[PDB]
Amino acid sequence: CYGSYARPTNSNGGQGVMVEQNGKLESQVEMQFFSTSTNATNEVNNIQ
């Protein structure tokens, strides 16, 4: 982290590589979901 820089690409202050998809329109960001490990193993409920 110390001594680390990245140039902004989004206008309003967001670092991210803009790939081309018939144009720069693509902001390839993938959302991931996470739950507690033990509750994701087995419990009295579906994982949350």
Partner: protein
């Protein structure tokens, strides 16, 4: 339990999970092991539950968050190994092979002829090299049928008149007795029985032809309703069992009603016509058909059906018995043996939707067959 450092220092069971709630993981962290994670953390507040060993009779314990599992050995069960197995033929066939019966909360297993009771009390051991009921795109008039292989269908025999033309089938039950249909006796005055037949136009050397010496027919036979359609033929020469010639066991009526009647499907083999008003099959053919309930059997039949007849076949699929299969046995494949449960009697058309082939019930004539096999034997 939790703090800036309570969960930042070394993980020790002599620290976190002991003097608060011990909600979770702090019993798993110390060991890094999710096996007894929820088989031990239930014992933090209210005390243990398997320490009493509720399961007796050498039964292991398993702890759950509220209820206890008791694993008792083979033939032992119970909430705490407390209940006992009620020995009846309803479930697991009472360990029997051929005849299962329940009486006085006990199971009687009895095997038919050719088998002896095993000392293990769970098996019937054969006493012969070839015992009964043991095996050792299709267009152009193939209604779901398949060709019998070598030894797959050894209990089928063909009846041939003086012109050597097959007209009816027969069941191999012993070395001298053949079971067939009563009406076939009216088709030809004299006929011979060929066993091990695989093709009418080709002789592979496994076919044995024997003349018929003694003919026994049911006295109460009725031509109008085709009732009591059963015949017994005693041949002049003995039948020698071989790879393609094997007998069929005779089950009991009560045991057939106990479990054989609930069977999903059965097998009928014969040399009958492929379809209605068609040519006779050149080779032996077998077909698998399901049982039909008695209500639909009576509702879909234009004639009177007594207790000696039952419907079988497919309501929609074009798979049903046809002409030329008269006298053919219906065989159900129990655990290791084929048992005869029906005899082809007749059928309103072939491969017709809404019609089921009517088969004679063997169980209603077991006593008659037994008397016939010993009256002149």
């Amino acid at each position: 339990a939790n703090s800036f450092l309570e969960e930042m220092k070394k993980g020790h069971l002599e620290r976190e999970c002991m003097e608060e709630t011990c909600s979770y993981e702090e019993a798993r962290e110390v060991f890094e092991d999710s096996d007894k994670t929820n088989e031990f953390w239930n014992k933090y507040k209210d005390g243990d539950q398997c320490e009493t060993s509720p399961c007796q009779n050498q039964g292991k314990c398993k702890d759950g968050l509220g209820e206890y599992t008791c694993t008792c050995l083979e033939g032992f069960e119970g909430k705490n190994c407390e209940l006992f197995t009620r020995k009846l033929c309803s479930l697991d066939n009472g360990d029997c092979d051929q005849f299962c019966h329940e009486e006085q909360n006990s199971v009687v297993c009895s095997c038919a002829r050719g088998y002896t009771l095993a000392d293990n009390g769970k098996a019937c051991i054969p006493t012969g090299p070839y015992p009964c009921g043991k095996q050792t795109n299709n267009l152009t008039r193939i209604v779901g049928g398949q060709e019998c292989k070598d030894g797959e269908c050894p209990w089928q025999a063909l009846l041939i008149n003086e012109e050597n033309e097959g007209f009816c089938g027969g069941t191999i039950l012993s070395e001298f007795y053949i079971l067939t249909a009563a009406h076939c006796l009216y088709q030809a005055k004299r006929f011979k029985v060929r066993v091990g037949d695989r093709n009418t136009e080709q002789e592979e050397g496994g076919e044995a032809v024997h003349e018929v010496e003694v003919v026994i027919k049911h006295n109460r036979f009725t031509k109008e309703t085709y009732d009591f359609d059963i015949a017994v033929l005693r041949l002049k020469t003995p039948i020698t069992f071989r790879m393609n010639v094997a007998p069929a066991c005779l089950p009991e009526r009560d045991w057939a009603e106990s479990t054989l009647m609930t069977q999903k499907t059965g097998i009928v083999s014969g040399f009958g016509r492929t379809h209605e008003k068609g040519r006779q099959s050149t080779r032996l053919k077998m077909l698998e058909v399901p049982y039909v309930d008695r209500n639909s059997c009576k509702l879909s039949s234009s004639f009177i059906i007594t207790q000696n007849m039952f419907c079988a076949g497919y309501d929609t699929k074009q798979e049903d018995a046809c002409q030329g299969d008269s006298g053919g046995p219906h065989v159900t494949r129990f655990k290791d043996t084929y048992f005869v449960t029906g005899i082809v009697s007749w059928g309103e058309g072939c491969a017709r939707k809404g019609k089921y082939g009517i088969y004679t019930k063997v169980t209603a004539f077991l006593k008659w067959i037994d008397r016939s096999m010993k009256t002149r034997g």
